[PDB]
């Protein structure tokens, strides 16, 4: 996955002694340390739990008589008063943590519950109350590893798509239609447990760095936005492996644009841009690059909503004709000059590509730089060649896409700024 800290908070931890600890969560580990107040950083490490060993995270029933420091009834209190407990359940008994606020406890529980979907020894039951004086107060059982006495409200074993085990059973898939092929081979439409529509990407053996994708899915499983194609899970206990996603009935945006019968109004085209920009603002906020943003990599559902697809997947492509910046399959005509010249990938190369995508949308799927080959494009865009204003784009709309192609990456806007510009034009109309 990634070594990035997803959540950082100061909590009160129970050993019976209670101590303030800085908790840091990564997809790999939940670690806690003494808090270096003076330096505003972590102090000495005091322990850690491997995320793969966590079987359950849930609230705890509060103690009936907790001292003032833990009594339910801003700056000073949020680091001195900890009344809301939660438990992290793993092999070595539960770990009890007290949050200063309810919102913060909710945030940690929500995040941890999603993360542990990846794990293999998940439980359906837990202990609602504290283990104290050699027994659980809820059921009076005397073993710390005693099975939970109460079923979880949304136990993963019985949870629906997006909340269940990350590994999906392929025997629960029905295949109904061929959706064509892409960089990793065949894709199909089908049903999960006979009711839920899904897309099944079947990974051609030898096309993907599978072990890296499977591990790194720990990060991608946390990406969720209304305008991102949702990843539901994987099937990796067979050959080939499958990637299971949200199904988009209308296919890829590029082919959608090229279907002349739609006869889109320019308001509809701007809405497509807004959809994509919202997805990209979300990915930018998670410091996650797409690296092949283009109309061909966006999909359209049966409601006409555009969503961004296959973000982050370039990293696992084994084909050097795709990966090489001069390869026949590399997306040269969406690549910023710095990418082509120096392999300088950043949020700003995604911004460049977004501009070309806006141009595609207002050109109804025309090939960019049609008069030029990939090699010619690479040479001339580094000199200052730019895509001209599409006939359907107003000067104001063109200014947005044009801003994406500044020769200096740092003078390119962010997706937050682009979205603001798009919303302004929608109002102005
Ligand atoms: C994403 C995708 C690829 N492309 C890839 O898998 C791919 C892999 C890697 C990359 C990188 C280069 C970035 C690494 C890019 C793309 C190839 C084929 C289909 C789909 C796809 C997916 N989903 C989630 C749908 O809902 C859907 N829905 C469709 C719905 C309808 C139709 C359609 O109109 N059809 C089907 C066949 O022909 C008849 C009409 C087609 C697709 N189509
Ligand atoms: Ca269609
Ligand atoms: Zn119990």
Residue numbers in the entry: 0 to 14, 23 to 80, 90 to 170, 384 to 658
From the manuscript:
The Tec family kinases have a lipid-interaction module attached to the N terminus of a Src-like module (i.e., concatenation of an SH3 domain, an SH2 domain and a tyrosine kinase domain). The lipid-interaction module of the Tec kinases is an extended plekstrin homology (PH) domain fused to a Tec homology (TH) domain.
We expressed a ‘PH-TH-kinase’ construct of bovine Btk that contains the PH-TH module connected to the kinase domain by the 13-residue SH2-kinase linker. We replaced six residues in the activation loop of Btk with the corresponding ones in Itk, shown previously to stabilize the activation loop of the Btk kinase domain. The kinase domain is bound to the inhibitor CGI1746. The PH-TH module contacts the kinase N lobe. In Btk, the PH-kinase interface does not directly occlude the active site. The interface combines a set of hydrophobic contacts with a hydrogen-bond network. In particular, Tyr 134 at the C terminus of helix α2 of the PH-TH packs into a groove between Trp 395 at the linker-kinase junction and helix αC in the kinase N lobe. The structure of the PH-TH-kinase construct, in which no inositol phosphates are bound, resembles closely that of the liganded PH domain in the vicinity of the PH-kinase interface, consistent with the failure of IP4 to activate Btk.
